[model samples]
Target: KGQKLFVSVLQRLLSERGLHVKESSAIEFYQFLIKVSPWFPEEGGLNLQDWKRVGREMKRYAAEHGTDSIPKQAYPIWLQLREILT
Candidate 1:
């Protein structure tokens, strides 16, 4: 429930700004989440705080780079943290 909602909310935010996120990206995001998230695969999805952790980082990114840069910059930033996923 909460898991899918995040996707939709994210998509809508992008859509409002004319940004399009690929479905494949969402899949990859879930894979990334499962790699780092402690509460992934839950019956009702991750708890609010877990998702909010990611969400909060997003605000920081937006603050630094502007929200318009999100679709372009988010993954690259995450990719920079790739070492942690292992």
Candidate 2:
């Protein structure tokens, strides 16, 4: 495995006991790292409150740069997010 698919191998247990960070094939924290993520549908919301705490930093980073920059730009917040995920 390679790319993010491999990261999931290490991150799999993150969803087991609590937080249950699953969405299709990606973890919740990993999903937000994508260029076009942070989905918010009006019909039914996801466990968004999970990230609400650290998500502000992610959004702040997004505002200061281009969409392609989120993965690296907001990477630090990812650590914070995982703790919340944990």
Candidate 3:
């Protein structure tokens, strides 16, 4: 869950910054995450609202503090997922 939150946060951040995404991209990325990551299905598939909620929170936090440095215990989901796929 923590790792998934981290991925949600990163995707939200990128979408906010107008990278390879726009407003709805966060939800799409999360849906893709849901489809690809076995962990997500193992947990009975995370809700889109859950992703939106986490994205909103991350956006708020970024508004306050632009960068999020993952501490050792933070466990970034995207990073872990990336590592596995790569």
Candidate 4:
């Protein structure tokens, strides 16, 4: 439920900024993150804090690079992450 709400809120934020993303698509992307995130492990193995930090770092990087151009730099979610937070 929390993830669903996050996606909905992000979708609205993207729309407000004139970025294109369907709500369902955003949900799918979030779902994909949840599915693949476990593949990476920290020194002591995977940790919640590490995952959160990766998310925050990606968000910060996207913002720093300029959001629109970020799509070209990252896998694709960078564009969404950039404006969705604000």
Instruction: Kindly list the per-residue Cα lDDT of model 1 for residues 16-70, writing each as its tens digit.
Output: 6566678767655555554444354563233455445665555665677665524
Error of 2 at 73 (Å): 13
The candidate maximizing TM-score is: 4
**Model 1 poorest 10 in a row by lDDT:** 77-86
TM-score per candidate, chains pooled: 0.40, 0.29, 0.30, 0.45
C-alpha displacement of 46 in model 3, angstroms? 0.5
Clashes of each: 0, 0, 0, 0
Q: Name every residue pair that clashes in candidate 2.
A: none
Better of 2 and 4 by lDDT: 4
lDDT of 4 by residue, 1-86 (tens): 35676576656766687777766667666554443343332121224455455566657665776565333323455444543443
Q: After superposition, how far is residue 40 of candidate 3 from its true place, in Å?
A: 13
lDDT of 4: 0.53
Give the Cα-based TM-score of candidate 3 against the true structure. 0.30
How much is 8 displaced in model 2, in angstroms? 9.0
Q: Per-residue alpha-carbon lDDT of model 3 for 1-86, expressed as tens digits?
A: 34456456655554564544333544444554543343543453345544444445545555775554422222244433333334
* Candidate ranking (lDDT, best to worst): 4, 1, 2, 3
Judged by lDDT relative to the true structure, which candidate is superior, 1 or 3? 1
- Please identify model 1 stretches exceeding 4 Å from their true place: 1-3, 40-86
The lDDT of model 3 is 0.45
Name the top lDDT candidate. 4
The C-alpha RMSD in Å for every predicted model, in order, reads 10.6, 12.1, 12.9, 8.7
